[PDB]
RNA sequence: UUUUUU
RNA sequence: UUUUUU
RNA sequence: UUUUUU
């Protein structure tokens, strides 16, 4: 009897799940105009409550699969969503021409029926759907950080993609109320985030403007709320050709339960295949075992070692109960790393003139990264002070 | 269990993709006049929105394959676009004589139907189509740099090809509004850029004026947004006959994760075969793994070493967070390279008179490249100051 | 709960 | 995001 | 892009 196996119980799911959901699909002869009516109903602020996930699935099936519902069901999006517990009931209506005529006759859709009579539609192309999905992909990196972080990252990606000349969005899409409602409809829908992630990752070759925007934004969403995974696996568990060895600041007996617990949490997380970098955004099952408050010493030490290697990770906020250990591991790794690079410069040169040139280069390089780290720290302090002045103002 | 394989997940596409697109093809008895009507509809500023990609495919099939649609489907352009996820639905209309009569009866094409009634057509030859495609190939090098860089490179290629006597373009094609709209229609279309790249690379022998312009402009587009690939693979990972060895400025332990990560990104990029130099323009799948912000030390060091070897790479702009490391690696490589050429001049001579002549030659050659590098730096500084004075003026 | 850069 | 030359 | 002579 192993009594210590009781501390790992109640984490892993045991079976594939018998929970079944129901999202509707619209089968219409006028699918492009139906889809554009869903776009301008969402953009107008109409809370289209239980029909949101089915309407967003009709936009994504219409854009990616020409709304045929036959090669959609063969496709691995639907195989994944069928194993996740979704069921597609197809609301077939061949003579429908408006969004009101396809909503089923239930009593609780009556605020939506009253809301959509006053909704005016401007006639628009098929490409407004792909414009909407490429705009919705811009909220995907820094989605789990908040709404202000998502809206600022998405505004920065709008100006980056408009200097490229790839896209241009309308000016009433870029107001802060509308970017609040698009953050709201993206954070809650699993199917919208998953099919933006799937068509971002798995499209190889023929990219239009929208496919390239979605593929660029899914590429910046990799390990989004999982900075602890990236800092521990790069800087704490170094891999050699001989094998994985620990770091000197984690190689004691106070830390070793967190290290052995973190390796079990990572081996749980890698059951998800190619969606393990997107685990915090898609809210997968191993997500509770990788928080900062489960590893209070491993996380602050790993961020201090990571900040000592790179300039930009001195902008990462932590809680007040992790700051001083982060600052201490930063100082210790600065001293250890200057000892190591002095030994390596003495190892790889050939003359005294060669080691004089390489010594002058690596001391100038270290002074460059230290001055950049202090610049990032000063603008982080001013950003926190400006946010606190806005919170005091509001 | 290799836990470090989780950091490479979510990058490579797993399957050939089940996303299918629909571009139309026009099958008409009067294909030359239909194609010239698409040329003067595009040149007039008519936003021919969803029919743009099919109209450009009809121009390219009419120019390259005589619009027969039977040897087009055997040809490897269509095999590549069929594996990319395109489907060609052929709008057969044997008695059509205008561009209005072949547009399908949909409600969202009605601004285009109203736009094309007022469009006047001048009757023109088959060679205005090849004139349009050779003009569209001139935006292909420096396409990913911007619109002003594309329009200035394309104006320079117009004057180069008119001193040759190969071509002459009409004077209303060379205004900046029209070159803005041809940059706009080339940046977004995958099929136009791909078939200009395919017929530029794979045409061996019988070139007319337009084929030679397209082949010259596709030859200058090789590694267009991939300067990091060219500078690292030339100057940082030197190949000997014995094998690949690193550079002394990247041979430490702070750099080795970026070097081993860059070799994985290059081995991803070389899955695309002969279209791997054109990966940033065609937006292929390995493109996110080769940015400057993923390798902040390898890229600035590699550009400094490259600038020390050649005069013209002192015109490359970088961000402000990479400039000083570029300047430092430039200084270190200047000192290391003068030590190496002094040793090689002592190795390859036979007398003292021979080494006196070779010493005087190589010191004059180094002074020539240093004065050229300072000239490039001064005109770069004045170009940036003039662009900032125009941005302040506008 | 997450916080940087890209 | 990309930035030079050809 | 090419630049001479024959």
Swiss-Prot record, chains A, B:
User: GO CC: one term?
Assistant: helical viral capsid
Presence of the UniProt keyword RNA-binding in the record? yes
PTM comment? Phosphorylated.
Q: Classify the source by domain of life.
A: Viruses
Keywords assigned: Capsid protein, Coiled coil, Helical capsid protein, Host cytoplasm, Host-virus interaction, Phosphoprotein, Ribonucleoprotein, RNA-binding, Viral budding, Viral budding via the host ESCRT complexes, Viral nucleoprotein, Viral release from host cell, Virion
Domains (record comment): This protein can be divided into a hydrophobic N-terminal half, and a hydrophilic and highly acidic C-terminal half. The coiled coil region is critical for homooligomerization, for the interaction with VP35 and for NP function in RNA synthesis.
The subunit structure is: Homooligomer. Homomultimerizes to form the nucleocapsid. Binds to viral genomic RNA. Interacts with VP35 and VP30 to form the nucleocapsid. Also interacts with VP24 and VP40.
**Name of the protein this chain belongs to:** Nucleoprotein
Q: What does the record give as the organism's lineage?
A: Viruses, Riboviria, Orthornavirae, Negarnaviricota, Haploviricotina
Where in the full protein does the shown chain start and end, and how long is the full protein? 1 to 394 of 695
């Amino acid at each position: 009897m192993d009594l210590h196996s009781l501390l790992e119980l109640g984490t892993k799911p045991t079976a594939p799940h018998v929970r079944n959901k129901k999202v509707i699909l619209f089968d219409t002869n006028h699918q492009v105009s139906i889809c554009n009516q869903i776009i301008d109903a969402i953009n107008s602020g109409i809370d289209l409550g239980d029909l949101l996930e089915g309407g967003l699935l009709t936009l994504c099936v219409e854009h990616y699969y020409n709304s045929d519902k036959d090669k959609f069901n063969t496709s691995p999006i639907a195989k994944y969503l069928r194993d996740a517990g979704y069921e597609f009931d197809v609301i077939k209506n061949a003579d429908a021409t408006r969004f009101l005529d396809v909503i089923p006759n239930e009593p609780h859709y009556s605020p939506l029926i009253l809301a959509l009579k006053t909704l005016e539609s401007t006639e628009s192309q098929r490409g407004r759907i792909g414009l909407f999905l490429s705009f919705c992909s811009l909220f995907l990196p820094k989605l789990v950080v908040g709404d202000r972080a998502s809206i600022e990252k998405a505004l920065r990606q709008v100006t980056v993609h408009q200097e490229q000349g790839i896209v241009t969005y309308p000016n009433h899409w870029l107001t802060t109320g509308h970017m609040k409602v698009i953050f709201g409809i993206l954070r809650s829908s699993f199917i919208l985030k998953f099919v933006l992630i799937y068509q971002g990752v798995n499209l190889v070759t023929g990219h239009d403007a929208y496919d390239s925007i979605i593929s660029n934004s899914v590429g910046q969403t990799r390990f989004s709320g999982l900075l602890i995974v990236k800092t521990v696996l790069e800087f704490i568990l170094q891999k050699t050709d001989s094998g994985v060895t620990l770091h000197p600041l984690v190689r004691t007996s106070k830390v070793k339960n967190e290290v052995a617990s973190f390796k079990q949490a990572l081996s749980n997380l890698a059951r998800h295949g190619e969606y393990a970098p997107f685990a915090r955004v898609l809210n997968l099952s191993g997500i509770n075992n990788l928080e900062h408050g489960l590893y209070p010493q491993l996380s602050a030490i790993a961020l201090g070692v990571a900040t000592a290697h790179g300039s930009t990770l001195a902008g990462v906020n932590v809680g007040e109960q992790y700051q001083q250990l982060r600052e201490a591991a930063y100082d210790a790794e600065v001293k250890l790393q200057r000892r190591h690079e002095h030994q390596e410069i003495q190892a790889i040169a050939e003359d005294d003139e060669e080691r004089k040139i390489l010594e002058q280069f690596h001391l100038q390089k270290t002074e460059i990264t230290h001055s950049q780290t202090l610049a990032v720290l000063s603008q982080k302090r001013e950003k926190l002070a400006r946010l606190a002045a806005e919170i005091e103002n509001n």
